[model samples]
Target: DLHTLNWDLCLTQANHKSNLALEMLKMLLDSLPETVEKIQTALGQNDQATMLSTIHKLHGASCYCGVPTTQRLCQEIESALKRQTPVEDLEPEILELLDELTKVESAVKQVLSQ
Candidate 1:
């Protein structure tokens, strides 16, 4: 479930161009580790502002790649942050998102290779 990709949506978003969709997915894969690292660093510092901004950017990127689970987690985190949830309370969510990113990486790579 965490690895699920709305591939059709990706194609549609890319105007039915599979290559373009692949490119978008590649971009998402490339950027995720850095983004996650940033989030982790921010979390360590209990810096809510950095976490929100980073996850918000990740949310936008995940939308284009059809990573619904990733996007949803990002959304949930964003919403929680907006509600002024404590950084410690968000640790589990961040960990889940990192796990989801690994799934996303493998899923996208499988698709791209095919």
Candidate 2:
């Protein structure tokens, strides 16, 4: 599901003032994998709050790169968690979701450049 957002507009807004989007983008690129890894660890430990926090970070990371889909997914997951979504059933789904998000993160990096 390759959502066609206005990539140029999104990228442009990252640094609407001074092209600092690249800076935020760079930080996100560096932290994204670690964030996902943390999310996975939190999940393994059955820490809902940690999972939500990790997702939240990923959401912010996505915003830095102008990727709305990840932001939306993280928001959705956080909302579901806030509602106390059943973990027994959500574990696999959440893992899969995070894995998918990791893929998105990897794909997005190629678009960022100096």
Candidate 3:
């Protein structure tokens, strides 16, 4: 599911400053690509500890960025990892997570560029 940004909440956290909100959004956009890769890298390496750590961090970041769907996906992945879910089984969830982030990245860019 694609998340709808809570712009009011986001700006409220930014003290109602559009410029700062835009800055925050840009920062999130910048880190996103690397964040996605790190997850994959950890998975490929079969590093459960690293994968769990990465997913936990991603979940929190998604929450702070107010991407509810992404946050939910992160939580799911994190739990699956904790349960020792095989990579093959988790592939679809990871793809969904990536898809959600794509929408988030586009929205962030569009809003900040406006």
Candidate 4:
């Protein structure tokens, strides 16, 4: 259940090159920790606008690299925010997204090391 890739999508996005696809994945993985930290900081500050925009960015990035779980979580968070869900109420989903990011990190590393 830990398979995080949509390999066909990745290959298509990268013009059918496995190496390029892997590089795209690496780019996403590299940027994610700092991006997540920003989300955390925004959440701690009760900043909904920042949180929405940050999550939106992550969602877009995940789509590009075919990270389905991350993309889904981001979409859910975005929807909740659009529904005017309170920042405090979003903690659980945020935590889940963080957990997914950890999985994505390891998954990408495994692929890259091959």
Candidate 5:
């Protein structure tokens, strides 16, 4: 929902011109580590503000990387955080999302390396 420019216009542009995709992916690759660290730190600290902020960025990054599923998970995490809910209190579905976020971090790294 928040990624309207990414999945369509960017993807189209990337396919038509490989440089755009490489450019987009490289930018995301540079940001992935720190964004992911902030996200994990926010979760560990239970800082509501930071959690929401970091997850919001994470969702956008996920979308930029063509990982809509990661975007959805981060969105769900963002929704729960906005409610002042922590990961420990999350429902089963939300817990699964949290787990997925962990995986997505590594996945982003892998994609970026390529």
Candidate 6:
């Protein structure tokens, strides 16, 4: 299941407690979009520094949330930006990352609401 959360890692980090893990996961999901929106807003303003900073923060949160691929995409974008690479070159990846984020958000919401 590509959209499946890494339940083991999540619960383990919550000290083997399902309710705690679920609550934390909900919080993480709640913040995910706001973080991404910050990045999007920064990108629109051509603010590379802010974009990179938000991506870094989002990547860390994604890792803690056990979203490995999303974390990797954020790292890749951050590296490319730090290298002063053109945002044009990273556009496709950014779109894909956004799509992935939406999927993950939906998946998490379903689990929480279930």
Leading candidate by lDDT: 1
TM-score of each: 0.90, 0.74, 0.77, 0.87, 0.64, 0.81
> Using TM-score as the measure, which candidate wins?
1
Tens-digit per-residue lDDT, 41-68, candidate 5: 7656757787677777767766656655
The Cα error of candidate 2 at residue 66, in Å, is 1.8
lDDT of 6 at 9: 70
lDDT tens digits, residues 1-114, model 6? 343366677765667888877877888788887877886787667787787788777777776565666877888998999899876677777777888888788778877786
Residues 1-114 of candidate 2 have per-residue lDDT tens digits of 344123554556664643576666567668766777887788778788788777776776666565666666677777888899955446765776676666665655655632
Compared with the true structure, model 2 gives a TM-score of: 0.74
Stretches of candidate 5 off by over 4 Å are 1-10, 13-16, 90-114
What is the TM-score (0 to 1) of candidate 3? 0.77
Model 6's C-alpha root-mean-square deviation from the true structure amounts to 2.2
lDDT string, candidate 3, 1-114, tens digits? 235455666676667787777677678889889988887787677677877887888776666565778878888988888888986678788889877787888777767667
Candidate 1 vs. true structure, TM-score: 0.90
Model 3, 106: alpha-carbon shift in Å? 0.9
| Candidate 1 residue lDDT tens string, 11-48 | 77678888888888888889978987998899899999
Give the better candidate number (5 or 6) by lDDT.
6
| Candidate 5: residue 15 Cα off by (Å) | 7.5
TM-score comparison, 3 vs 6, better candidate: 6
RMSD of each: 1.6, 2.9, 2.6, 1.8, 5.3, 2.2
Error of 5 at 19 (Å): 1.7
Per-residue error (Å), model 2, residue 108: 3.4
Q: What order do candidates take by TM-score, descending?
A: 1, 4, 6, 3, 2, 5
Question: Can you give the lDDT of residue 34 in candidate 4?
Answer: 98
Off by over 4 Å in 1: 1-3
lDDT of each: 0.86, 0.66, 0.76, 0.85, 0.62, 0.76
